[PDB]
Design an enzyme around this catalytic site. Sequence first.
Site, short mmCIF file in Angstrom:
data_model
loop_
_atom_site.label_atom_id
_atom_site.label_comp_id
_atom_site.label_asym_id
_atom_site.label_seq_id
_atom_site.Cartn_x
_atom_site.Cartn_y
_atom_site.Cartn_z
N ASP A 100 0.84 -1.18 0.00
CA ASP A 100 0.00 0.00 0.00
C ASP A 100 0.89 1.24 0.00
O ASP A 100 1.40 1.67 1.04
CB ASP A 100 -0.94 0.02 1.21
CG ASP A 100 -1.96 -1.12 1.18
OD1 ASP A 100 -1.77 -2.12 0.46
OD2 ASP A 100 -2.97 -1.01 1.91
N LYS A 164 -6.80 3.48 -2.55
CA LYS A 164 -7.12 3.47 -1.13
C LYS A 164 -7.33 4.91 -0.66
O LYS A 164 -6.61 5.80 -1.10
CB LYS A 164 -6.00 2.77 -0.35
CG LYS A 164 -6.09 2.80 1.17
CD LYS A 164 -5.00 1.89 1.78
CE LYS A 164 -4.85 2.08 3.29
NZ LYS A 164 -3.77 1.23 3.86
N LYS A 196 -10.26 0.60 -1.62
CA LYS A 196 -10.04 0.35 -0.19
C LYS A 196 -10.25 1.60 0.67
O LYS A 196 -9.36 2.45 0.77
CB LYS A 196 -8.63 -0.22 0.04
CG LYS A 196 -8.31 -0.45 1.51
CD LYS A 196 -7.03 -1.26 1.70
CE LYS A 196 -6.62 -1.30 3.16
NZ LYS A 196 -5.27 -1.90 3.36
#
Lengths: 246, 247
Positions: A100, A164, A196
């Site tokens: 991430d 995200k 996300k």
Amino acid sequence: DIKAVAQRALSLMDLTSLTNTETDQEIIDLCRQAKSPAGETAAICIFPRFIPVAKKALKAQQTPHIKIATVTNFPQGNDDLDIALAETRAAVAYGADEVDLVFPYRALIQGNETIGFDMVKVCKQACSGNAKLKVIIETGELKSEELIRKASEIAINAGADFIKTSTGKVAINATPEAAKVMLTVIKNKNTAVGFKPAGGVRNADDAAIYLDLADNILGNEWADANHFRFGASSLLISLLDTLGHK
Amino acid sequence: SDIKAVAQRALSLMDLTSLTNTETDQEIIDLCRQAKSPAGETAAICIFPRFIPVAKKALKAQQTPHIKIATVTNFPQGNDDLDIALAETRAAVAYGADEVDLVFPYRALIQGNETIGFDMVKVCKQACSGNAKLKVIIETGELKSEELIRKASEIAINAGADFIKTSTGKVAINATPEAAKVMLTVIKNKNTAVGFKPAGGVRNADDAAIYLDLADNILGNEWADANHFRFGASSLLISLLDTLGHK
């Protein structure tokens, strides 16, 4: 049915611990927690150095299918490509399943769209054949719809597997408004890209808000574990409580 | 030996170390600044793997490219899990380490498992190929006996260690003259290209003289340069600079 929601959200969780002072035992304990009485979370999310210990624990308890996500360029989202790439290379070498990466959002706010593309691209290349790349655009700092959309578009163009919303480390993290913008960008560009939401999802009611957005924008069957994750921690206890596991 | 001359000599052999595991970017940059000392540059810095990119950037910005970046893996426990030690070593290399200081599985050796130590050092040496040197910490303070210290050294060297290092600095007993003598003797007997690194509890020029004198007497005066000898130390730097009359 709030129990159906809770069950669904649990299976989409990236169970997160990012204090940066975890002990190895706390990582083992987190992996144990991910093997919940109502089923396994989709993943855990931890700092890179904890990946070998986590991989070992997840294997020992016979849940190797629980992915190990980690973070790079985190939490600041600086615009130094060499540093972000080095960290992402290391995350992959540690054994990460997913990385991430924090987008250089401040650079974008100052009008630089180029460093964001470049950074996401080289880090995606570094994950090739080993890991998926999620890109954190930090919607709470981008604030405006235009910037949130723009970061989303750049990240997808540069090869992100997920977009995200947040690091969890700033004032404002996941919001329904930000989520609707990002899910809409996904629909218009590439439905293969996952979404996300992270931070601010604490119970099944919060989870349902984001699942309902995904279902209404992309269809009822779109949000599986390959396309939707919750970045969260305390959410798991709340979900288990809702499912009758006190 | 002359104590000031030793101070000057020892300073250029330092792996200036910070391993609190709570360092910030600023503390790393400051460590790099300290390594560029008024008496000369240390041989290296030694930090946890995640700080390597920030350190690299800082070392370049102060124009000291020759200060190597060392890091640690399987650290400090020296567990006997090969896959974990290998993955950490691969990550350390990926981060950009010039040198990786690996903890030998010394507790396994004490229990009679000599093979895991060989296998672990070897695969980690291979992971460093083309990118970094491998130092192997055998933790002499825990091995204690001359026999076990000699055996861990032999195994590390046979498996491909570029350096053998006494200690993590994280246990009660670290570098000792006795342990140093055994290790330097193994180097003398097996492969003089292998370097020696006393670490932990080296707090002044008097401490440093002990290990330099041993190296000089066993391997010769010319032997202990930065390719063959390092001090694993932190506060030592300030002590040496004070001895040398620098601020």
